[PDB]
Design an enzyme around this catalytic site. Sequence first.
Site, short mmCIF file in Angstrom:
data_model
loop_
_atom_site.label_atom_id
_atom_site.label_comp_id
_atom_site.label_asym_id
_atom_site.label_seq_id
_atom_site.Cartn_x
_atom_site.Cartn_y
_atom_site.Cartn_z
N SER A 16 0.77 -1.03 -0.18
CA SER A 16 0.10 0.00 0.00
C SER A 16 0.88 1.17 0.03
O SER A 16 1.38 1.51 0.95
CB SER A 16 -0.83 -0.02 1.34
OG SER A 16 -0.33 0.77 2.32
N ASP A 17 0.88 2.22 -1.06
CA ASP A 17 1.46 3.29 -1.37
C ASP A 17 2.95 3.30 -0.88
O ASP A 17 3.55 4.33 -0.67
CB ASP A 17 0.75 4.37 -0.72
CG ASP A 17 1.08 4.57 0.73
OD1 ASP A 17 1.78 3.95 1.32
OD2 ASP A 17 0.57 5.66 1.32
N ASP A 18 3.62 2.12 -0.92
CA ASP A 18 5.20 1.92 -0.89
C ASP A 18 5.86 1.14 -1.90
O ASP A 18 5.33 0.07 -2.11
CB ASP A 18 5.40 1.49 0.52
CG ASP A 18 6.63 2.30 1.17
OD1 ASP A 18 7.35 2.71 0.30
OD2 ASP A 18 6.87 2.27 2.55
#
Length: 135
Positions: free
Chosen positions: A86-88
């Site tokens: 998630s968003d990394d």
Amino acid sequence: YVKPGGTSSGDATTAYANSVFNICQAVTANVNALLSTDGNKIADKYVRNLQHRLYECLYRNRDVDTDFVNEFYAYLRKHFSMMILSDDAVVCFNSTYASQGLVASIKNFKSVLYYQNNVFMSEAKCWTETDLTKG
RNA sequence: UGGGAAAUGCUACGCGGUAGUAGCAUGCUAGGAGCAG
């Protein structure tokens, strides 16, 4: 109150939604980077023909075209590999291509975020690693 | 006149069942704790 938008935190599908959004940002950065390069100085025909076909399939043809989708996805897998939480994200990308602007770079991401998210990524926050011994 | 069965005990072998003991792996459940986005 009334929440204008944006994801909450206490639901069950936040991580997956963020992952999908991340992949979309990366792909659109690649598309934008490829289409803003002069076609008079590209490498072997293959990529320049790909750019031409890409513009056609984007703005001229109306319905979907499966084969070119498969071809572009394979090209991305070849020269742009992603691992995504998630968003990394971590990206291992061919450098000589990105030298001539045939794949993404941090400036493309900055531009995409500026015009699609209304935030300004400061480049002092990202990192670029040249060696592969250390991960 | 070159014809033999059963009831008893011992020993050994194998199987089955029963119980108890120990080991191994796992599947579930519950509890408590820590890390990450």
